[PDB]
Design a protein around this ligand. Structure first.
Ligand SMILES: O=C(O)CNC(=O)C(=O)O
Ligand code: NI
Ligand code: NI
Length: 366
């Protein structure tokens, strides 16, 4: 029984044979990565942007140390730290981690992956990729007057010691994510969200042997993507991945939902509920933003229909799927747990109806 995170587990991982991520990912320049481009070719595979040129991505120089983070964030903040060899969550002060990080004699491999600093002084030092901000649901549809607290999952600071490892998972709410390495190196292990892979993943996630079974072996292809310093990786909706901090590293990233793969996003959300995921508490109002998106997407469809235009295939697919989700959450036998998530400014039953006829119409007049 070789368990995840251990020294033995890392020896194998570091010497295994993985098809190169180069087989599925698209490398491009910051300027080519546009909303327009993605609406044409879609966002179905990871995108690597080697140079931060034209991304709109701004951040401290490659010399920003873990020490500078203690200053700008406040060594007092209690952050979640992972005990890699045990694959268990812990809690430390940002001050203690930095003490532990800069200490040559590291007794345990500890990793920090959830430090969201948008509500801190260091926030001013980072501007996220324009494409993320452009596609982001929170950026485009979150009201300035909701009772719900706006979700802040756009700026995370990642720090890890060599050999820290994160097992296979799907980001909360099936969010896409942008990831930039400041210094050091991270190695991603990517798995395509095919119907077969999702099934196995959920099964692997609910099996007791999960920690002793490398999920990479359970699928046809597990791609290795090395993210070196200065590079920016963009992972799309539903992608199953694991990460290995190959060397002391500091990176930045953020998650975001969008209209390109709503179906997949909803699928992942439903799965996270079936598994009871602790990460799904970062996007606690996923259902709320979904109601907001449904209202905007309805307006757009109304506009195209009343003028004789046909919506792009993906938009109809996404709305059709969003309709199914909303209708599900409204079921008498389930609404008791979804009711509070419905926005004050929306009429649930009516919105779902308008959605049904606008979709039916598109189905008929086509
Ligand atoms: O820790 C890492 O290197 C990568 N982490 C993640 O992808 C995550 O937390 O969702
Ligand atoms: Ni992740
Ligand atoms: Ni978003």
């Amino acid at each position: 029984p070789v368990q995840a995170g251990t020294r033995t587990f890392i020896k194998e991982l570091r010497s295994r044979v993985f098809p190169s991520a180069d087989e599925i990912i698209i490398k491009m320049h910051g300027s080519q990565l546009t909303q327009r481009y993605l609406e044409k070719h879609g966002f179905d595979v990871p995108i690597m942007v080697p140079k931060l040129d034209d991304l709109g991505l701004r951040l401290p120089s490659p010399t920003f140390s873990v020490m500078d983070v203690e200053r700008y964030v406040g060594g007092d903040k209690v952050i979640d730290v992972i005990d890699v060899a045990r694959q268990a969550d812990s809690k430390m002060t940002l001050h203690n981690y930095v003490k532990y990080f800069m200490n040559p004699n590291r007794p345990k491999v500890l990793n920090v992956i959830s430090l969201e600093f948008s509500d801190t002084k260091m926030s001013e030092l980072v501007e996220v990729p324009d494409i993320a901000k452009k596609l982001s649901w929170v950026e485009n549809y979150w009201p300035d007057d909701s009772v719900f607290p706006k979700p802040f999952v756009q700026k995370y600071c990642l720090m890890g010691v060599q050999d820290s490892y994160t097992d296979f998972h799907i980001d909360f709410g099936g969010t896409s994510v942008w990831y930039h390495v400041l210094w050091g190196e991270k190695i991603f292990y990517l798995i395509k969200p095919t119907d077969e892979n999702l099934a196995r993943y959920e099964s692997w996630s609910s099996s007791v042997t999960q920690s002793e079974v490398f999920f990479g072996d359970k699928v046809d292809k597990c791609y290795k993507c090395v993210v070196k310093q200065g590079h920016t990786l963009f992972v799309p909706t539903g992608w199953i991945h694991a990460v290995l901090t190959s060397q002391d590293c500091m990176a930045f990233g953020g998650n975001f939902l969008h209209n390109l793969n709503i179906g997949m996003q909803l699928r992942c959300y439903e799965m996270e509920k079936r598994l009871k995921t602790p990460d799904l508490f970062k996007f606690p109002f996923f259902e709320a933003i979904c109601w907001f998106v449904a209202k905007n997407l309805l307006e757009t469809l109304k506009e195209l229909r009343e003028d004789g235009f046909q919506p792009q295939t993906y938009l109809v697919q996404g709305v059709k799927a969003l309709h199914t989700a909303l209708k599900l959450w409204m079921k008498k036998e389930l609404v008791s747990e979804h009711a509070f998530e419905i926005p004050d400014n929306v009429r649930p039953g009516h919105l779902i109806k308008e959605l049904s006829k606008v979709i039916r119409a598109i189905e008929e007049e086509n």
